[PDB]
Design a protein around this ligand. Structure first.
Ligand code: ADP
Ligand code: ADP
Ligand code: ADP
Ligand code: ADP
Ligand code: ADP
Ligand code: MG
Ligand code: MG
Ligand code: MG
Ligand code: MG
Ligand code: MG
Lengths: 363, 363, 363, 363, 363
């Protein structure tokens, strides 16, 4: 059985091909102690180990905006994934990895060198994340907008053919929303600064934030009452209350100028990607807009995306946003489907092909 | 039963001799994918298959101006015609094919070699398209002006005898009108460039274009109001509006200088063909001018042809333009009549005659 | 009832003895197609059939200058005459044929062999055409000037006796006038060249040409005004206008030098024929000059003949030109009278006399 | 010195009487621009000027089949001839013009009106072209077959006397052969349609076409090998190859049915012209058959004419075809000889005789 | 003195007629602040002002693909051109403007309305850009391939006459190459996204990119060494290094499939434009292929164009690419020559003609 590892910027999702859900889901973090030990202790902690001891750790993400910036810590996470989470020998199973489009070429080549020389996997393959999300929905036509912690990208596919010239990629994703929520929480006097407190803000974001259907009407509602106020208990028992920050944080996905970015929102990025495609396939892309990733899990984002794209598209087009309830695992689920196909078993890059063609075989 | 295949530049019309209408009518196109497949797909698409997937295809016509330029794609269309459209075994039926006059000799010889060596037809015959159109109208005397996608030709026939020295042929037909409509649509800011968008312009031409009775009076009407403006919805919901382009495009049939051509219009070509005939038969040709082909399906072309030929012919002649409502299928209908005649069953070129006389038997 | 067939160079006039007019009058032509048939058609056309389809035919006269030059086509005309025009069985009726004087001996012998061996007529007789014209006028004394399409001949007869030494024959007739009209029509830019266009010129000649009383005065009248101009509409609606060609064409009958001929005009030929007769019978020939044939049907030819012969004859002679209005059929009418006489029934050449005396019985 | 202008349908040959060759030889064409000028250009081009710029011009011949159809363009060619080519004042020299026999009377009268009222020539004369060709050969007896671009005519002359009744004229000449070569070049896929491309086909005809001695044997030779194939480089570097079209095009001179014409070939036209002459002069005409004009410049036409006339003439006659190597200029050379004769100086039509006798003096 | 304004998609080149170089050359951009001012600042910046402050601006091009999309910003650029750059009163000088062929009709009419109603110019004229480039080279015959930031178009001209039916236009130009360089720079981890960073990529393109003579040989050279690597210092001191991207970016001009476009390269577009012209003028167009515009300023593009057209043209044609070193200003230089011609002073459209004929006078 093949191993499917979906390693975006924020999470590591691993499991076996053929299953319907990842077996191991943990944060893609490496924590190191920032104090002195006095008791007569591991040197570093990975994943949920680092998340539970984060009070005395400095947390580091080895992947930033889809790109591995620390390859030593990236091997710790893969080692922790294989031996501690899945508890398998990686030299016995082919590994299917994922990657965002328009990534540096050296990123995929280093992933290949590590899988073949450090873990000694027999076969290997690197797929595009948005393509796997279309496998998960059981479609061959559609435009996938995948947004995780580091990357947001749109990939249009028609009848199984990708339109690579129409692929768009934004560096605006979940990390920027957490960073923005930290900034607007200072307006109420809540100061979060350390890497451990950044994990608390992300937990606040995932539990209290939502997408407003009309932002200006929602701002006027929050300024005239308190029906939108929600409380949240910090780990030390302190209770914070947030109001319009609940929908102002996800609003940066549609108005990136809140972050000082010049780019377009996720609705205009999806529309611009459709408009780069041929006129004859746009009608099918409008009706098969698929959301994927953890950053699409805000309540009300599918209704907001449909409203915003309807205002950009011609009035005779049928805008249909497909947001399955399991779309946080769509990349992994689609990778599990792909690695189980019989027509895919010739797509593997074996270790022999890597020894005779070098790392350039992965491109 | 014999097979009747009318394969002009634009369309493929196929059926069985004795029927009153073709059973298979599809565009004579071969589409190949111009992108990369990412889903784990045929290598080429023919006819209506290529027309529905044209968003991701490069469309190619194997016949250009009546002459087959790609014999590999021409066999794909004939193979698609026999096995997918008609669903017959071509080695059991004689095949009646059509061809424009004044074509290269090697074009008809290659059609004969393919029908006998690739499809193994028992018998075969290649007829002239304008002659078949006269069978469809139930006449033995008349001048047929047939205009399709690639070729416009006039063939005068008197009492069953053809006047080959009076046959005229123009390379101005439906393809040049579509190409001209694409050019004058840029005046309103509508840009069509790809082969898929050329199919959209042809659809615009067939639905909105018409022949003006007086061109200069029609130009003054369109410049003073908007009663001639029509809208058209593109496949992606965008709506374009055209005014004088509706009659300026078909006007190139009567004024080929709009295309930069030096040749004469279809009215002067018909008149020059009559004037090459003997003086004693011109009166019968004037009264039996038969229109045929898809390019004669513009509204108002019969009234315009009659007006233009009346101005060229002597005032005592009776100009009568015969434009039947089914004249888009006249070549096929006439071929179905001819292949069903008992006096035609000796005109077939059997495979034995082809083996003993070579490909020169077809001439 | 006997059959009377008057077959000159141009026309075939057939009917039954006793009638006052021929029942069948058609051009003595055989037309064959000069193009290729494409419609899935007789091999040749005779008479009015060839005249109506002459646009696609090559027209041939089997009789040239009174002499049959094509005996295969001559049988087609006789076959068409008996079975299609008269609709009789020629093996039941005696046939009276006509011939110009001073013809080759083999011409009359071949007519006899065909009538007895091909059509199996019971009896047969060949008469001289000018002698029959004198029967038609009810005279026994007179000089007959018969002019058709091929031959002009004068035969003087006195009290029922022919003067064979005074018979004159000219090869100047209607064919040469049509040929001359074609030549002088080029002066106005009218080009007639084909055998079908020669039939049009002959129609122009029969409708617009006339004999001028004084040629030089008529030439001066046409050169000073336009009262002599007449229009004529061609079969294709084109209108031609002719002036002095109307009387210049028939003037060749009186001045054969217009045709490059050295012979004398029809007036001097008639006078020379009278002067070869005995002095005692010339006075009766001067008073009984009978015109006959289609070439004598020009308006004003009787007044011109009288004026020209009066200038040649002594001033005390009474010149009387007899030009009956039915003189185009005089040979046939006279043959119908002769074949009905009871004293003629012993002049027939029966088939028994032909079998025992050979073809020399006809001379 | 008198000016000699030989202006047939295709070429204009001009010079001075007494010289042995024309000084100016250029195509009788007038070209007008068929596009729009954008550079900040003459309105029309004549002769070699139009031939070099023919890519952007519509070429028109003012003379068609020996008859001037455009008198405005005919004056442009004469004006270009006098002032640009010969560089003389036409009001100082008498002009000798040429004309085909059996031309419309108004054609010669308009040439006289233009020479006297537009160019103000002192004297003028219009000669028959075939008569001048006999001066060029130094003969007083012979039949001249002159064939140019528009007209083919035969004029028999005996001891200095013309036989006008034996003059024959065909409208089959070089223009019809070029038009026929264009038609049979489509059999190999070579499409020439514009007036500029017609000049290219004429160049192909003059360089590659020849007359086959036996046509059926030559057709069998070309169908069994490739020794008759010749290549020709088009102006744009494209190379075309022609085989049996090299001798099929000139074969229309001997079999006009290839053009759909009913007329006889040039061999039968020459023979029919001799047979219209008196029996006593035919022997001298058989031995002095003179070829003239550009259409007689095909290799092998003299040997073919001799073979074809020998088969028509009695076996005891000596058929001698005189084809001088300079017979393309025979009409001009003979006109230069005639205009230099002292016994011709009274044949000029002075401007005084034209003012007192009108335009009818030229006939 | 007349004003010459060459305003393509990317640059604005302005000056006075008669000069040899534009006086004002600045980017055709309008920048607006995308932040909040806190210092107690113009509302928008044009040209070099916007280019120097682009760090805090959003840069907008009012002309996209040759078509003005923002007429308010287009007036800001013209106002900045007249009053700030040239420092003249536009109501005193006639203005010569430029435009790409096959542009929307309303684009030229709005330019005319603004020049006459907003700037009150006395006279005005709009020329075609490729025609002006032929004035700059001192030629009247040649095919001009002009490529700027928005449009690539070929205009063949022969002897001063344009062939409008042979004009081709591509929407592939400098903007698409900059956009493509941004995409392939992500392969090395260089992320440029904002409109200010797009100006940096364009600067990289103009300094480091070149056209490879053989693309596949150049790709193999770059993959085997580092002799093609060049460094570039960003505005903030960061140094980027690019290898095969130097010639892969300009290669999209010859292989537009790199951009996902179906169209043909600039070499095949030039060849197809020549092949639409008459056969007689193609030889002169092959020898006078003129390059123009900023997108033709890549090193090695003239040698590559000659190599690619030589492979398409017949081997006997002489392909000569004329690439003057000042061809970035050819449109302006040619407009300066045209506006100084005395024969052009009647081509101006005065303000009186605009008031009496409306905006339709410009077409
Ligand atoms: N219920 C939720 N609501 C909003 N955001 C969420 C939710 N769950 C996860 N996220 C965000 O999704 C991001 C990561 O999503 P995911 O696609 O699973 O990870 P990866 O970046 O590895 O692809 C994180 O930044 C996280 O804050
Ligand atoms: N209703 C219509 N009006 C105008 N043009 C038409 C119409 N229908 C078809 N055509 C044109 O006719 C051309 C082909 O006609 P047809 O004779 O059926 O094909 P073929 O070229 O195979 O003979 C096409 O170019 C098409 O644009
Ligand atoms: N009305 C007419 N006027 C002048 N010529 C005529 C007229 N009718 C007939 N002809 C001429 O008479 C010729 C034949 O006359 P006819 O004697 O009837 O024929 P055939 O030659 O058979 O004896 C034809 O050449 C025809 O042109
Ligand atoms: N060498 C040649 N071979 C065959 N045909 C020729 C040759 N030279 C000229 N011709 C033809 O002769 C025709 C004109 O001949 P010419 O008698 O010189 O002109 P015109 O028609 O003015 O009398 C043209 O149609 C041309 O094609
Ligand atoms: N040296 C150079 N090398 C390559 N490209 C250049 C160079 N200089 C300018 N360009 C490109 O030319 C384009 C504009 O050229 P130009 O014709 O001057 O402008 P316009 O679009 O106004 O006609 C820009 O996209 C620019 O990137
Ligand atoms: Mg994800
Ligand atoms: Mg058709
Ligand atoms: Mg008669
Ligand atoms: Mg000549
Ligand atoms: Mg430019």
């Amino acid at each position: 059985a093949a191993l499917v590892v979906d390693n975006g910027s924020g999470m590591c999702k691993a499991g076996f091909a053929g299953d319907d859900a990842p077996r191991a889901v943990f944060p893609s973090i490496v924590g190191r102690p920032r104090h002195q030990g006095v008791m007569v202790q591991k040197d570093s902690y990975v994943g949920d180990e680092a998340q539970s001891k984060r009070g005395i750790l400095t947390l580091k993400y080895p992947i930033e905006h889809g790109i591995v910036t620390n390859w030593d810590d990236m091997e710790k996470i893969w080692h922790h994934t294989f031996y501690n989470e899945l508890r398998v020998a990686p030299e016995e199973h082919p590994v299917l990895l994922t990657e965002a489009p328009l990534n540096p070429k050296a990123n995929r080549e280093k992933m290949t060198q590590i899988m073949f020389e450090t873990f000694n996997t027999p076969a290997m393959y690197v797929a595009i994340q948005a393509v796997l999300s279309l496998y998960a929905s059981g479609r061959t036509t559609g435009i996938v907008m995948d947004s995780g912690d580091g990357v947001t990208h749109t990939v249009p596919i028609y009848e199984g053919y990708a339109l690579p010239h129409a692929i768009l990629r934004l560096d605006l994703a979940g990390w920027d929303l957490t960073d923005y929520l930290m900034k607007i929480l200072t307006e109420r006097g809540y100061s979060f600064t350390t890497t451990a407190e950044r994990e608390i803000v992300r937990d606040i974001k995932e539990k209290l934030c939502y997408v407003a259907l009309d932002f200006e009407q929602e701002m006027a509602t929050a300024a005239s009452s308190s029906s939108l106020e929600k409380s949240y208990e910090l780990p030390d028992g302190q209770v914070i209350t947030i109001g319009n920050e609940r929908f102002r944080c996800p609003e940066a996905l549609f108005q990136p100028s809140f972050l000082g970015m010049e780019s377009a929102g996720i609705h205009e990025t999806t529309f611009n990607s459709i408009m780069k495609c041929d006129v004859d396939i746009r009608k099918d892309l409008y009706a098969n807009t698929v959301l994927s990733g953890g950053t699409t899990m805000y309540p009300g984002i599918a209704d907001r995306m449909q409203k915003e794209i309807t205002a950009l598209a011609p009035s005779t087009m049928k805008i249909k946003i497909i947001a399955p309830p399991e779309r946080k695992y769509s990349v992994w689920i689609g990778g599990s489907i792909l690695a189980s196909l019989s027509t895919f078993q010739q797509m593997w890059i074996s270790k022999q092909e890597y020894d005779e063609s070098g790392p350039s075989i992965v491109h």
